[PDB]
Amino acid sequence: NLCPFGEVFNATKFPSVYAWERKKISNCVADYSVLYNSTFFSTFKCYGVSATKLNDLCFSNVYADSFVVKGDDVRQIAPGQTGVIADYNYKLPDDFMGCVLAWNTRNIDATSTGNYNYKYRLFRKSNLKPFERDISTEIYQAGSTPCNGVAGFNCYFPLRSYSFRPTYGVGHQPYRVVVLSFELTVCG
Amino acid sequence: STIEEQAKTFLDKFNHEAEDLFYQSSLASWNYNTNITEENVQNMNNAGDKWSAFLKEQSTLAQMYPLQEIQNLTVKLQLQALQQNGSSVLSEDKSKRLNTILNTMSTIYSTGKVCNPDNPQECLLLEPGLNEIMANSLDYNERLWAWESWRSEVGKQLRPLYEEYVVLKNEMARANHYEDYGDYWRGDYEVNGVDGYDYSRGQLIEDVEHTFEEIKPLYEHLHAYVRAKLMNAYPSYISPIGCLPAHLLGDMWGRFWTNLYSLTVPFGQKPNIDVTDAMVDQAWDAQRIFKEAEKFFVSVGLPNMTQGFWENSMLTDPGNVQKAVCHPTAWDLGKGDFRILMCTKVTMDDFLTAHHEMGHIQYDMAYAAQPFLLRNGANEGFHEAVGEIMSLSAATPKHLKSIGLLSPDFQEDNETEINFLLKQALTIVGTLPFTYMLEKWRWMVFKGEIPKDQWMKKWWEMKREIVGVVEPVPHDETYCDPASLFHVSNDYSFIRYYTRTLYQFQFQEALCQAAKHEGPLHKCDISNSTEAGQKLFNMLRLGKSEPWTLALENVVGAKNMNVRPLLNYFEPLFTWLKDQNKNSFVGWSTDWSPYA
Ligand SMILES: *[C@@H]1O[C@H](CO)[C@@H](O[C@@H]2O[C@H](CO)[C@@H](O[C@@H]3O[C@H](CO)[C@@H](O)[C@H](O)[C@@H]3O)[C@H](O)[C@H]2NC(C)=O)[C@H](O)[C@H]1NC(C)=O
Ligand SMILES: *[C@@H]1O[C@H](CO)[C@@H](O[C@@H]2O[C@H](CO)[C@@H](O[C@@H]3O[C@H](CO)[C@@H](O)[C@H](O)[C@@H]3O)[C@H](O)[C@H]2NC(C)=O)[C@H](O)[C@H]1NC(C)=O
Ligand SMILES: *[C@@H]1O[C@H](CO)[C@@H](O)[C@H](O)[C@H]1NC(C)=O
Ligand SMILES: *[C@@H]1O[C@H](CO)[C@@H](O)[C@H](O)[C@H]1NC(C)=O
Ligand SMILES: *[C@@H]1O[C@H](CO)[C@@H](O)[C@H](O)[C@H]1NC(C)=O
Ligand SMILES: *[C@@H]1O[C@H](CO)[C@@H](O)[C@H](O)[C@H]1NC(C)=O
Ligand SMILES: [Cl-]
Ligand SMILES: [Cl-]
Ligand SMILES: [Zn+2]
């Protein structure tokens, strides 16, 4: 059977980066011609493997991570980054083997009145481990005074929402990212 | 947790929350200036009041972090910016009354109109009525009427409002640990913390006066040359040893002597460099003007204009179907949104202005990576100086010939160059004594050195001595001539125009050295010079993070403003003026008046 790559890339709804979702790919044959011979993506950078030799290759299973970040935050979806997205939202291992694909979605993910659905984690105790996922909305305690559930002075809400608008610069417009992880069923 | 670390996380919350509210307020005022409706004037105020109310909330929240407990100089600058009490240090009624007089002054300045006694049905406001008279008319009485009526009609109304304006502004500055309101304005140049780069608020007064003494010789010869030419235009009205009457200087206040070029042109026979008809014949539109201006910044190493610039800017007048403010402005809404508001016409003056405003955008694009409170020029004079150096290079005949707007066989005589420098001096160096004397008068008023019963008495004593300009008719304390200027009655500092003028020539001389220029400084064009662009970008990226003394040092190599680069620009004209004034009187007597 063909692997459902259209179910992740052409998916209508995409999740926030802090609550990124993962989809496992098991027994199916892949067709990477659709993903590689297309100028629709703005970023198409592979790590540990090449963008062409994958056609004659097999893996135990493929994991597809999908989320939405701003244009300038796409550089952090890469091995060895230390930004806010990489530390508190989505971190890749140093020995990552896969490809990161992103494309601009200004017309569907940014509204004139401000699309505040897409969020990200700004404050967190320590960084996330590789492939870790944190959806906790606990009040972040930045000070010594306890917060007791109510955010106040030195007590900030951990999540802040992206503020995507179609008039933003390209660096602040919404970009949908799909990270394909390779683990050693799926062949070319 | 360290107080420094608690403040850093607080600034993170602020930088993300303020960047969103500032964009809503900026886009709201954009929708008004590009589409003047009542629905947009309230959306501008609603998003504006929300940003103002947000800044006050974060102000008191930021004050709970002791600024002395912070060791990081960068985060220390951000807290100090938020901890400014501003107008809230007043009581609820004094702050409410302050905004009432500030609005009444701004209203009567823009809506005040004077009527002609000879024709009472002819009533004109300042723009374009009275400004057209002061800029074109050659009638002594017509100019004297427009000059006196503007200061006796709308000036006298500002006198009681400006008195209460001074006392209320002093109660704010003295309450914020400042000597006076003048000391508050000088705090923009204040640097305190960096060894070898500090700068006190009082040091500005010392430096502005020290550099002004070196401008006196160039200004005195320009004053003597203009006076000699003005006597031929107004015989039996000007003394060859006295000051120039104020109503004969080219505009309402004598701020710029640009309109005197037709009366003071050195060589009227030589062809004028106006490429206006050239672009009209080559089928140029506003897109070509900005595309060509975009190519200029790319030629020096700076990047292109963003897609949002080409998608969102208003480069033409929408006409009677959509009213819009046509003041050329460069908008930095934040979040990667850079725009330019300009009703561009196919002329040479709009071609040079397009380079000025796009220079502001290149400055805004550079420091966009800095935190929110640090996205601004080094001081109040740095931004205008960057935009001015672009129009200097774009206006040189070498640049116009290379683009195709001037004929390749245009001969650049030594008289065409004196014509250009004389026109530049009437605008550039002619405003320096006016700018300094004006801010000097307000500094003394705020400090309490000029009592109310001699505001206008001391105002014209300084006009005669510093600027060399005498009033045509005597004014008592009923008048308020300084308030008849926009910047005085609209609560704006004015010393920025003096400092930017010395900065722009320090920048030009510094860039032309990196550009390997070899001729006179006024003939320099930094086009195609990637070295000059890299030298300039090293300061644009700093924003307000590094002190202005350090940012200025990164380009010119000096920790303070210098007047020598300004004199080198007008050096060929300065030696020519001394030769012209060999049989004239250089200087003026502070006693002659056209009514003694
Ligand atoms: C004042 O505080 C700021 C921020 O706390 C200090 O600047 C910060 O310096 C660190 C160390 O280099 C920067 O982190 C670096 O990020 C890059 C990104 O790729 C990474 O490769 C490095 O491994 C490192 O993690 C941090 O970005 C930077 N902050 C900013 C806003 O640029 C600054 O040095 C402090 N100044 C003083 C005088 O204490
Ligand atoms: C910076 O360097 C560029 C290098 O291209 C200079 O632009 C070039 O300017 C010359 C005129 O000075 C253009 O020559 C013209 O070529 C056409 C042929 O298409 C010819 O028919 C005309 O009579 C004219 O000679 C040349 O095309 C143009 N370069 C390009 C690529 O179009 C530019 O002037 C330099 N800026 C400076 C020195 O400030
Ligand atoms: C999504 O739809 C477009 C429609 O043009 C198609 O070209 C593309 O291959 C589709 N993507 C996937 C992953 O099937
Ligand atoms: C602002 O005013 C309040 C009112 O008491 C005062 O406590 C605070 O110190 C002032 N802020 C500064 C920076 O002086
Ligand atoms: C700038 O934009 C022009 C199109 O307007 C393009 O041809 C050129 O390659 C761009 N150059 C840079 C450095 O962005
Ligand atoms: C221009 O130069 C010529 C000789 O090169 C000289 O005779 C003439 O006086 C100069 N004109 C001016 C205005 O200096
Ligand atoms: Cl005046
Ligand atoms: Cl004198
Ligand atoms: Zn400007």
Secondary structure of chain A in the HEC alphabet? CECCCHHHHCCCCCCECCCCEEEEECCEECCCHHHHCCCCCCEEEEECCCCCHHHHCEECEEEEEEEEEECCCHHHCCCCCCCHHHHHCCCCCCCCCEEEEEEECHHHHCCCCCECCCEEECCCCCCCCCCCCCCCCCCEECCCCCCCCCCCCCEECCEEECCECCCCCHHHCEEEEEEEEEECCEEC
- Distance CA(A58)–CA(A104), nearest Å, equals 30
**B271 Cα: distance to centroid of ligand 9 (angstroms):** 29
Angle at B174 between CA B169 and CA B180, to 5 degrees: 65
**Partners of residue A106 in chain B, C-beta under 8 Å:** none
- B508: helix, coil or strand? helix
Cα–Cα nearest to B422, from B312, B583, B270: B270
| Token output for B72 | 């990081």
Q: Which residues contact residue B70 at a Cβ distance below 8 angstroms, ignoring those fewer than 6 apart?
A: B3, B4, B7, B76, B79
Per-residue DSSP letter, B583: G
- For residue B336, the chain A residues in CB contact (below 8 A) are 168-172
Interface test with B, best of A106, A107, A147, A154 (most B CBs within 10 A): A154
CA B73 to ligand 4 center in whole angstroms:
22
Residue of B nearest to A145 (CA): B1
Whether the Cβ atoms of residue B420 and residue B522 lie closer than 8 Å to each other: yes
- Residue whose Cα lies nearest atom 13 of ligand 2: it is B402
Angle, nearest 10°, between helix axes B286-299 and B382-394?
Answer: 100
Pocket test residue of B292, B402, B527 for ligand 2, highest count of atoms within 8 A of CB: B402
For strands B329-334 and B337-341, give the pairing: antiparallel
Check if the beta carbon of residue B291 is closer than 8 Å to that of residue B309. Answer: no
> Inter-chain contact A154–B306, Cβ cutoff 8 Å?
no
CA separation, residue B216 to residues A154, B90, B209 (Å): 56, 42, 11
CATH topology of domain A6-187: Alpha-Beta Plaits (3.30.70)
Alpha-carbon distance of A80 to A168, in angstroms, equals 28
3-state SS class at B360: helix
Q: To which H or E segment does residue B124 belong? A: strand B123-125
Span from the CA of B88 to the centroid of ligand 4 (angstroms): 10
List chain A residues with CB under 8 Å of B20. Answer: 114, 163
| Structure tokens that stand for B13 in this block | 């919350």
The identity of residue B249, as a single letter, is L
Kindly provide the b/e burial profile for residues B375-386, where b requires at least 16 CB atoms within 10 angstroms of the residue's own CB. bbbbbbbbbbbb
What span, in angstroms and rounded, lies between the C-alpha atoms of B52 and B24?
Answer: 12
> Burial letters for B467-489: b for 16+ Cβ neighbours within 10 Å, e otherwise?
bbbbbbeebeeebbbbbbbebbb
Q: Tell me if residue B417 is catalytic.
A: no
Give the contacts of B336 (CB within 8 A, at least 6 positions apart): A168, A169, A170, A171, A172, B306, B308, B368
Q: Which residue is it, tokens 């723009």?
A: B127
DSSP for residue B589: B
B255 labelled binding-site residue: yes
Pairing of strands A155-156, A58-59: unpaired
Please, what is the end-to-end C-alpha distance for chain A in angstroms? Answer: 11
What is the spatial distance between Cα A33 and Cα A26, in angstroms, rounded to a whole number?
19
How remote is the CA of residue B457 from the centroid of ligand 8, in Å?
18
Please report which residue ranges of B83-153 form alpha helices under DSSP H.
Answer: 92-111, 131-136, 140-152
Tell me: is residue B328 an annotated ligand-binding position. Answer: yes
Element (DSSP H or E) covering residue B123: strand B123-125
* Catalytic choice (B357, B439, B509, B546): B357
Instruction: Return the closest-CA partner of residue B336 out of A82, A73, A117.
Output: A73
Atom of ligand 1 nearest to the CA of A81: 19
Q: Which helix (H) or strand (E) holds B403?
A: helix B397-403
Which residue is catalytic, options B247, B355, B383, B487?
B487
What tokens were used for B334?
A: 């934040």
B292 lines ligand 2 (CB under 6 A): no
DSSP secondary structure string, B128-140? IIIHHHHHH---H
Q: Is B463 annotated as a binding residue?
A: yes
Closest CA to ligand 6's atom 2: B414
A61-70/A119-121 β-pairing: unpaired
CA B285 to CA B69: how far, in whole Å? 57
Instruction: Find out whether B327 is annotated in a ligand binding site.
Output: yes
What resolution in angstroms does the PDB record give? Answer: 2.6
Query: H or E stretch including B552?
Result: helix B548-556
> What does the angle CA B406 – CA B569 – CA B210 come to, to the nearest 5 degrees?
155
Q: Is the CB of B298 under 6 A from ligand 5?
A: yes
- Asked if B357 is an active-site residue, the reply is yes
Ligand 3 contacts (CB < 6 A) are A 5-6, 9-10, 34
Q: How far is the CA of A102 from the centre of ligand 3 (A)?
A: 14
By residue range, what is the domain housing residue B26? Answer: 1-596
- The tally of domains found in chain B comes to 1
User: Cα separations (Å) of B239 from A129, B217, B310, B579?
Assistant: 84, 20, 55, 21
Return the structure tokens found at A52. Answer: 């062409």
**Chain A window 99-158: which residues touch B at a Cβ cutoff of 8 Å?**
114, 122-123, 142-144, 153-154, 156
Q: Is B151 annotated as a binding residue?
A: yes
Q: What's the CA-to-centroid distance between B516 and ligand 6, angstroms?
A: 27
d(CA A11, CA B496): 55
Residue nearest to atom 2 of ligand 3 (CA): A10
Fill in the amino acid letter for A148.
N
CB contacts of A170 in chain B (<8 Å) are 306-308, 336
Shortest distance between the Cα of B379 and any Cα of chain A, in A, equals 26
Q: Domain spans of chain A? A: 6-187
Residue nearest to atom 12 of ligand 5 (CA): B304
Instruction: Point out the ligand nearest to the CA of residue B441.
Output: 7
Within 8 A of B338 by CB-CB distance, chain A residues are 169
Elucidated via = X-ray
* Closest ligand 6 atom, residue B576 Cα: 14
With vertex at residue A31, the alpha carbon angle to CA A30 and CA A37, rounded to the nearest 5 degrees, is: 145
How far is Cα A88 from Cα A122, in angstroms, rounded to an integer? 7
Put simply, whether A163 touches B (Cβ < 8 Å) is: yes
Question: For residue A143, which residues of chain B lie inside 8 Å, CB to CB?
Answer: 1, 6
